[PDB]
């Protein structure tokens, strides 16, 4: 599980770096300059680039979900690699808008022992909120996890 | 044509760097170069590589292409081109499966160039080794310089020496 999580995280990080790379920004700026016969090809490029962006986003989402699931499984399957809870939390906080990640966290992270979340309790507590609470909302899941950790280790 | 001349100068520098190292000097790893003489901002003159033929002309020629001559039962070049252009406005998975289907019915026949041009086993081995070394060195140099648009009509192969020449 740890090896699969590491590989999925590496692929997701590579995709994220490609999205934030200066090459992507230069290509987008070139397309914007080009869009300002000529019409047919302009709309053709404005459709092909959108299709490629959608496919890349779908691949990134799939890799992120697989990495989060494998990290959760690795955490539940042992204690030697408890330090990777930092990576799991970083992915969860940086991808709080994804409903699948929040649902996976709600379904499986509650089985994870709470003492693994103790070192990063400051960062878990600093993200508490109310504006986006709900059945699959990130805030409600985070509040429930924090409350369960507090109940297990109040000290 | 000034860009071509600058690229030729960089290829000459790569050749000189490869020459002074004994590992590549022993293997004779060189880049084929042709003189480019720009004359104006719109017109120019450059060296014509005598004895060279485009790899696409040798491989996928409509009349006497290598694929047609050696594999008549396989898909023609026009059929593969049409199939690839049809799946252009489609999904990525459809593009991948179309490409795999085309590759299944299109087997490479480029190995016959040295067989039909160099009947002597010693000369055939020398030409094949020179071709492999030229391809490896040109590929590494192109990757280092970020060379692009390396399609079939932009690559020339010497008939006498079996060494790839990169143009455009
Ligand atoms: N230096 C050369 N030596 C020999 N043959 C050459 C050379 N340059 C071009 N050719 C031939 O000319 C053909 C056309 O290539 P080129 O002259 O670059 O025109 P083009 O394809 O229209 N390129 P471009 O003008 O940049 O769009 C090639 O397929 C070669 O057969
Ligand atoms: Mg050309």
UniProtKB/Swiss-Prot annotation, chain A:
Effect after changing residue 10 to S: Found in a patient with T-prolymphocytic leukemia; uncertain significance; also found in a patient with early-onset breast cancer; uncertain significance
Outcome following mutation: residue 155 to D: In AT; lack of phosphorylation of target proteins
Places the protein is found: Nucleus; Cytoplasmic vesicle; Cytoplasm, Cytoskeleton, Microtubule organizing center, Centrosome; Peroxisome matrix
Posttranslational modification: Phosphorylated by NUAK1/ARK5. During the late stages of DNA damage response, dephosphorylated following deacetylation by SIRT7, leading to ATM deactivation. Acetylated in vitro by KAT5/TIP60. Deacetylated by SIRT7 during the late stages of DNA damage response, promoting ATM dephosphorylation and subsequent deactivation.
Domain of life of the organism encoding this protein: Eukaryota
Induction: By ionizing radiation.
Tissue distribution: Found in pancreas, kidney, skeletal muscle, liver, lung, placenta, brain, heart, spleen, thymus, testis, ovary, small intestine, colon and leukocytes.
Free-text function comment from the UniProt entry: Serine/threonine protein kinase which activates checkpoint signaling upon double strand breaks (DSBs), apoptosis and genotoxic stresses such as ionizing ultraviolet A light (UVA), thereby acting as a DNA damage sensor. Recognizes the substrate consensus sequence [ST]-Q. Phosphorylates 'Ser-139' of histone variant H2AX at double strand breaks (DSBs), thereby regulating DNA damage response mechanism.
Quaternary state and interactors: Homodimer. Dimers or tetramers in inactive state. On DNA damage, autophosphorylation dissociates ATM into monomers rendering them catalytically active. Binds p53/TP53, ABL1, BRCA1 and TERF1. Interacts with NBN (via FxF/Y motif). Part of the BRCA1-associated genome surveillance complex (BASC), which contains BRCA1, MSH2, MSH6, MLH1, ATM, BLM, PMS2 and the RAD50-MRE11-NBN protein complex. This association could be a dynamic process changing throughout the cell cycle and within subnuclear domains. Interacts with RAD17; DNA damage promotes the association.
Family to which this protein belongs: Belongs to the PI3/PI4-kinase family. ATM subfamily.
Entry's free-text remark on domains: The FATC domain is required for interaction with KAT5.
Protein name per its UniProtKB record: Serine-protein kinase ATM
Protein source organism: Homo sapiens
Gene transcribed to yield this protein: ATM
């Amino acid at each position: 599980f740890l090896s699969l999580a590491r590989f999925s995280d590496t692929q997701y990080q590579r995709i994220e770096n490609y999205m934030k790379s200066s090459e992507f920004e230069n290509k987008q700026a070139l397309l914007k300059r080009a869009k300002e016969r000529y019409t047919v090809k302009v709309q053709r490029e404005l459709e092909l680039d959108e299709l490629a962006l959608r496919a890349l986003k779908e691949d990134r989402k799939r890799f992120l979900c697989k990495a989060v699931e494998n990290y959760i499984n690795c955490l539940l399957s042992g204690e030697e690699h408890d330090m990777w809870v930092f990576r799991l939390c970083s992915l969860w906080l940086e991808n709080s808008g994804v409903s699948e990640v929040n649902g996976m966290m709600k379904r499986d992270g509650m089985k994870i022992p709470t003492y693994k979340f103790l070192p990063l309790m400051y960062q878990l507590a600093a993200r508490m909120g109310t504006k986006m609470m709900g059945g699959l909302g990130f805030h409600e899941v985070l509040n429930n996890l924090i409350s369960r950790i507090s109940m297990d280790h109040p000290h | 044509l000034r860009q071509d001349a600058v690229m030729q100068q960089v290829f000459q520098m790569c050749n000189t760097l490869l020459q002074r190292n004994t590992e590549t000097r022993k293997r004779k790893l060189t880049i084929c170069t042709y003189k480019v003489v720009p004359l104006s901002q719109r017109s120019g003159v450059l060296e014509w590589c005598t004895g060279t033929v485009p790899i696409g002309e040798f491989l996928v020629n409509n009349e006497d292409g290598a694929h047609k001559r050696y594999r008549p039962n396989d898909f023609s070049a026009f059929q593969c081109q049409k199939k690839m252009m049809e799946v252009q406005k489609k999904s990525f998975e459809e593009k991948y499966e179309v490409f795999m289907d085309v590759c299944q019915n299109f087997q490479p026949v480029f190995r016959y160039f040295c067989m039909e041009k160099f009947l002597d086993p010693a000369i055939w081995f020398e030409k094949r080794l020179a071709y492999t070394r030229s391809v490896a060195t040109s590929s590494i140099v192109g990757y280092i310089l970020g060379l692009g648009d390396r399609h079939v009509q932009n690559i020339l192969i010497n008939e006498q020496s079996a060494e790839l020449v990169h143009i455009d």
